[PDB]
Amino acid sequence: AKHRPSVVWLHNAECTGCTEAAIRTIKPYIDALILDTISLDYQETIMAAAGEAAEAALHQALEGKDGYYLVVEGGLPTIDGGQWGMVAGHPMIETTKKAAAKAKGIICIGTCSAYGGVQKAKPNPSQAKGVSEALGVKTINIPGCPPNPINFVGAVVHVLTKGIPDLDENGRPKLFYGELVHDNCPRLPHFEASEFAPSFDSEEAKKGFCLYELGCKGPVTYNNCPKVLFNQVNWPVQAGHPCLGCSEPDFWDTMTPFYEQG
Amino acid sequence: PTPQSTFTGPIVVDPITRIEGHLRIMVEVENGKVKDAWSSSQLFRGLEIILKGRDPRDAQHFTQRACGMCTYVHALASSRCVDDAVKVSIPANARMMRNLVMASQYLHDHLVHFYHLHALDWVDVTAALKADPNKAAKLAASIAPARPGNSAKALKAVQDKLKAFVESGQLGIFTNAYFLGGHKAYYLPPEVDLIATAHYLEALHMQVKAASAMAILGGKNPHTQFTVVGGCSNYQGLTKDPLANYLALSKEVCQFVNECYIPDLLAVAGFYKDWGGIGGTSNYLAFGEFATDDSSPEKHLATSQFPSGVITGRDLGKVDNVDLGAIYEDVKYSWYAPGGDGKHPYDGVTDPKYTKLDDKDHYSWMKAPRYKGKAMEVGPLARTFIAYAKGQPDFKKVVDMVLGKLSVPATALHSTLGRTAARGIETAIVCANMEKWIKEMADSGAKDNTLCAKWEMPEESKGVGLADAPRGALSHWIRIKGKKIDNFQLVVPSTWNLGPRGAQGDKSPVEEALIGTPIADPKRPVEILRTVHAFDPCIACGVH
Numbered sequence A: 001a002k003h004r005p006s007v008v009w010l011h012n013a014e015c016t017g018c019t020e021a022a023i024r025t026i027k028p029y030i031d032a033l034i035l036d037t038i039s040l041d042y043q044e045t046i047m048a049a050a051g052e053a054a055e056a057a058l059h060q061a062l063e064g065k066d067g068y069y070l071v072v073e074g075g076l077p078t079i080d081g082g083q084w085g086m087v088a089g090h091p092m093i094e095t096t097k098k099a100a101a102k103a104k105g106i107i108c109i110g111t112c113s114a115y116g117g118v119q120k121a122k123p124n125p126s127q128a129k130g131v132s133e134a135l136g137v138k139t140i141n142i143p144g145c146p147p148n149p150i151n152f153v154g155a156v157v158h159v160l161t162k163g164i165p166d167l168d169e170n171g172r173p174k175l176f177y178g179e180l181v182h183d184n185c186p187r188l189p190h191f192e193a194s195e196f197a198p199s200f201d202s203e204e205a206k207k208g209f210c211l212y213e214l215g216c217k218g219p220v221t222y223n224n225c226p227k228v229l230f231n232q233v234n235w236p237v238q239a240g241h242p243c244l245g246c247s248e249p250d251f252w253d254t255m256t257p258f259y260e261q262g
Numbered sequence B: 001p002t003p004q005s006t007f008t009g010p011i012v013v014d015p016i017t018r019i020e021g022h023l024r025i026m027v028e029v030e031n032g033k034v035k036d037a038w039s040s041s042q043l044f045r046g047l048e049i050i051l052k053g054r055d056p057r058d059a060q061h062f063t064q065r066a067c068g069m070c071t072y073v074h075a076l077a078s079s080r081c082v083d084d085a086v087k088v089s090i091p092a093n094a095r096m097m098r099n100l101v102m103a104s105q106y107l108h109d110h111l112v113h114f115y116h117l118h119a120l121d122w123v124d125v126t127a128a129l130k131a132d133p134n135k136a137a138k139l140a141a142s143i144a145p146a147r148p149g150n151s152a153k154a155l156k157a158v159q160d161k162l163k164a165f166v167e168s169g170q171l172g173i174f175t176n177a178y179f180l181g182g183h184k185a186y187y188l189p190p191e192v193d194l195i196a197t198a199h200y201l202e203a204l205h206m207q208v209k210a211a212s213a214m215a216i217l218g219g220k221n222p223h224t225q226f227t228v229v230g231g232c233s234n235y236q237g238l239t240k241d242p243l244a245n246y247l248a249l250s251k252e253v254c255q256f257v258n259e260c261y262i263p264d265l266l267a268v269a270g271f272y273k274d275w276g277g278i279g280g281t282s283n284y285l286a287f288g289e290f291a292t293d294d295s296s297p298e299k300h301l302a303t304s305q306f307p308s309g310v311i312t313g314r315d316l317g318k319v320d321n322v323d324l325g326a327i328y329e330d331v332k333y334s335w336y337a338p339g340g341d342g343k344h345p346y347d348g349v350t351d352p353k354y355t356k357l358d359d360k361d362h363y364s365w366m367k368a369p370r371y372k373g374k375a376m377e378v379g380p381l382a383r384t385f386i387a388y389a390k391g392q393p394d395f396k397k398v399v400d401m402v403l404g405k406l407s408v409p410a411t412a413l414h415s416t417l418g419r420t421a422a423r424g425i426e427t428a429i430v431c432a433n434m435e436k437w438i439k440e441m442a443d444s445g446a447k448d449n450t451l452c453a454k455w456e457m458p459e460e461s462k463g464v465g466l467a468d469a470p471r472g473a474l475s476h477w478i479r480i481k482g483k484k485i486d487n488f489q490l491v492v493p494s495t496w497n498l499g500p501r502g503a504q505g506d507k508s509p510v511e512e513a514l515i516g517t518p519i520a521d522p523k524r525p526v527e528i529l530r531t532v533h534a535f536d537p538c539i540a541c542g543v544h
């Protein structure tokens, strides 16, 4: 009966899309992951316990003899002493700080946890921060809104069995984030020939022309979308839509207006 | 009778797990029944504030991130909203594609909800270990279609897997479960527990396929990327091969709905028939979905195949039209500033003001939406009652099918059990219409590939986007000034259902529905969970 490594997953300022993205994994499927590879010891979306029963389970995993890994989804709201984001009557920052203290490692799943994400966009009413900023601790960042399950599960498996993968300047594993979306785009020959859709209704759009003039942030976004696809079937540009640059820090302010370049 | 303790005192459940987002529930209990309640949302993000001054074209990308469980729906609502503000009529192909992605969302969402969010309130997973798998296969061969996944062999492999997991000592997600060591509120025979758990694990794989279907039209899931003002961008989504794959995947999903979801739902209901008298409310609202005419909010309201309407005081004989002027939000009991009560969303104000935890005067980040002073339940039950009362043939057939199968009157649907069954009902009806819808767009596509209409941004305008999302009536309301966002307000199904009291101190639907809840065990108040989960709560949705 081999011990499986403990994983505590916290939800802070999030929309739960990263949790949803995670459970789309097919190599392996989530059930094989949680029955065979890890011991998923706290996960509010799917755990059976509620309330004080739940909160105890967290405090059991945190006090586990063999330690644990920390998965964080969501940013941290810091205004009014963290009180705009609370669980079991504690500010999220407080609980995340507690959990980070003793973690073997910290994986930030999604742009929110990694860099602050949507609630941190101007004018940032909740004074939201990414984890490493709120805690002052190094994180492994798996950004995207949400990231591909391939990138998250790949990271998790890599950490448990190989070690900490090589990270770039923004804490992203080079295994998945080493290349520009644009460099792997099937529309790149259109880009190189200056064949651009001027609008979504144009004949050019119908002919699958490059979406750059409609705001495509492919040339400035690091992600593996066109190589690995989503849900084994598709990706935005294939579905005719520009990339939003959703894996880039603070993209909500640096890649907007989304239908422009300016 | 229903197990019920004699406990008198407060119970707080925080976090409510197995929902989207952060909810605290407070109740007063007197002799083992709930006598008062408060639904307290515990996170504020402020997307409405964030949108101010931005490009109306960007709204859908920001608002999608209101929620990743009910992904897509907010992108859809905002696109409709801005389409309305710029007065553009989307092409028929865009109407069909948008509606099909909503259909795919319903299937994905409702399946995950029953199995992975709700079922653990009714199913004792560790009792499944006490089941004899040969007896379970036999029980299954009776109450449910024949399938190799319900064989003794299959059921014993599930049992074996779960046995190794439990004996490991690491319960993972089942750590401290309210059902460990048994619980008088848990009624299922061990054999039904084993069937339901086997299906729980299958559902984990099938939800992957439902999302794949969605991604064919939507570009990816979660968070679709195929909608634009004036229509859709996905010209590939109108072609033969992708649509064939989509059909294939949908049919696989729908098979699972009819072989597993419905029979399970019906079994569970059959053992929890007492729950037909717990958690009723009285008022229902729907904006309708799956319209044949989405040229205007008016046309959507009128031509939705899951019809729109208003029901009051359980009066099925009188479905009114939706008055969109008659909607407003109150903040009397929410963490917002004085002066915000009775705002129509076009005059929406979102000015956050926190006070303190369990402040009976201000206890939630949700506003309180009201319809002429009335709190309204939205979602599958609302849609079901409204469609039923209008005599929509699919609902009429299926409802009476369920009524006859459980041998209960229509009026037992005004309950937690009914709320739960309604979700299943509408999933079955979506399933039954997929091929019709898919063939209509394939044909439409094949003929002409117009997908996006041309439009001009006005200096100044207002617009409203209506949708019936998986959880209920959804609206996005924009004011445009100087070609920028002047005000943008979301009023979201969970806001309707789980918000706090309104300005008159009137309980919200979940708050009302909690009144009369029996509590077998105040240490482990599963009953609170049954009712709250039945509403399928999404707090990120509700507060945004």
Ligand code: SF4
Pocket (backbone or CB within 6 Å): A013, A014, A015, A016, A017, A018, A073, A074, A109, A110, A111, A112, A113, A117, A118, A144, A145, A146, A147, B065, B068
């Ligand atoms: S990164 Fe995106 S999908 Fe993930 S929690 Fe944040 S807003 Fe949601």
Ligand code: SF4
Pocket (backbone or CB within 6 Å): A181, A182, A183, A185, A186, A187, A188, A189, A190, A191, A209, A210, A211, A212, A216, A217, A218, A219, A237, A243
């Ligand atoms: S700008 Fe966008 S659509 Fe164009 S080649 Fe680059 S990634 Fe492809």
Ligand code: FCO
Pocket (backbone or CB within 6 Å): B067, B070, B073, B074, B469, B470, B471, B472, B474, B492, B493, B494, B495, B537, B538, B541, B542
């Ligand atoms: N369905 C759904 Fe999400 C909520 N509440 C929305 O809108």
Ligand code: F3S
Pocket (backbone or CB within 6 Å): A144, A145, A181, A221, A223, A225, A235, A236, A237, A242, A243, A244, A245, A246, A247
């Ligand atoms: S928007 Fe995000 S999902 Fe990939 S295609 Fe662009 S990085």
Ligand SMILES: [Mg+2]
Pocket (backbone or CB within 6 Å): B048, B367, B489, B490, B491, B492, B543, B544
């Ligand atoms: Mg709102």
Ligand code: NI
Pocket (backbone or CB within 6 Å): B020, B066, B067, B068, B069, B070, B071, B538, B540, B541
């Ligand atoms: Ni939601």
